Amino acid sequence: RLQLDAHASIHENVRRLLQFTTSIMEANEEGIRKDIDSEFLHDFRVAIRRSRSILRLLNGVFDPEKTAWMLAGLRELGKRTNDLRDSDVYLLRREEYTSLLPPSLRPALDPFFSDLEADKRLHHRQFCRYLTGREYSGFMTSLKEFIAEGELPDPETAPLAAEPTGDVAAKTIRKALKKVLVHGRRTGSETSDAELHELRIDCKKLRYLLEFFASLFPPKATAQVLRQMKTLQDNLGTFVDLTVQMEFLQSRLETIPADRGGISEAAAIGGLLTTLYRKREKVREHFHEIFSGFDSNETGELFDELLTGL
Amino acid sequence: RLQLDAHASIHENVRRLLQFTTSIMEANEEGIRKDIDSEFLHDFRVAIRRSRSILRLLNGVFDPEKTAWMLAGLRELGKRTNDLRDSDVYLLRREEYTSLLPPSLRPALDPFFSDLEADKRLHHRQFCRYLTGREYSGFMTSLKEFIAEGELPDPETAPLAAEPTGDVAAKTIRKALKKVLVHGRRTGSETSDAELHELRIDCKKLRYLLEFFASLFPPKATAQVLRQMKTLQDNLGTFVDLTVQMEFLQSRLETIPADRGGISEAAAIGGLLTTLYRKREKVREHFHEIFSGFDSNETGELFDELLTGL
């Protein structure tokens, strides 16, 4: 569980989050090494992404060099997971991708999935060697030691550290919400890829803050605010998910062997690109109605209820 | 116009149809040669298809050898149009096909359409040389001479020739209708390609007979029967149209150059194959409701009204 102290410094409460996320990371290491399921690496990656996002949003809680160090180490750790995560995600989409194609184009996906399987085993081997290596080991020891340091840092170099948690929460949640509503209002009928990609990140940052600060508020207010968000984050999530999938298939299309075997594969990958592009235009077409619903009296009300008297 | 004599032999009335269809064919020759529009060759082809279909359905109206001769000559003439017709049809689908693909896959269609354009000019040249040649010229002279021969043929070798038009119409329309209803009832949930392809032909034969015999009936009864059919023939037409398109794209996919240029083209053609396969499954899924609607009291009633006292 993540239980925050309502009256503690934001320093104490961020250290609690990092104890929590590093414990999740260590608790998922066995399942990753034994390759039980994709969810072990997913939870490992979410722990990292959550930690980095709060460290950036609450910049000034730790000394600049310690912050830069934590961000750089967690970024490196996340980058080390990417190839293995990609293998899992695309192997998991095998039946979905197969079911989009005409019967005539499916046999060309067999070698494609066989190759992803071989790349998974390689990527799994590489990540396990990195996990049991001394660079990972030393960083996690140091990170664990640092977040066990209760001393407030120099206020002049870490001016947010000594601040009351409730006020930082109020301030950062309202800022994150405003950034979502303003960027969302600015997106006219053009509804560009750049516009939606930014807005997904904005929504992610707000959801991370809400989830971190949850235990400060009456649990009903937090659940309702998280719910009020869900359709917008789902829509942006799906739009970006489909974008990343098409970038992957597009890049594979560029490196396909220039031979008869490659022709067949190119036809199947063109099938998936075409189908996914069509899906993503439906998701784009739904954005404005979904944002309009979120940009309401009810949203403002639920946020005022969440943050009452802070 | 096609005006049948209600009390004449079916011999006289089939000869009227053939005078009519050969006049349409000759009247479309200038437009084809000057390449005005695709509709000139379309009407030329429909005239041929209509003539062949009635000659087969009313086998016994002419001597066997004259029938075999007319069918073989009209088949050859139709085959001579196929390459030019295919060029027209696929060039006409340029914007449709382009609009199905993601922006990234469209540039690969440019060389594809450029090649279809070059094949059109070649096919147009070949068909014009055939039209002004002596084999086409001699067959059309002979066909025109033969259908101007009013003598009834030997009843023993052409036993249908002397029959009253109204009774042949009644008999052939009820047979064509029964073949549609029976083959349609036999198609269970499997709704196979073979099942729908046959049923399209069955419907075509019924529509050709209705259109040939139109002027025998009160014009309202014929219009209503043609209307009652339309949704079924449209559905089968579209299903087969999409099938033929996918066979064309599939065959082009097999002969794509095995090089980097071909990879890009294969991706675009796979996009079209995938999209068209999806469209055709929606059309297949609509068949049973549409056939159920046609297989009704109202259909039986309209046909009884059409054929009353024959």
From TrEMBL, chains A, B:
Highest taxon of source: Bacteria
Shown residues within the full chain: 212 to 521 of 522
Domain annotation CHAD: ranges: 7-296
Origin organism lineage: Bacteria, Pseudomonadati, Chlorobiota, Chlorobiia, Chlorobiales
Protein name, as recorded: CHAD domain-containing protein
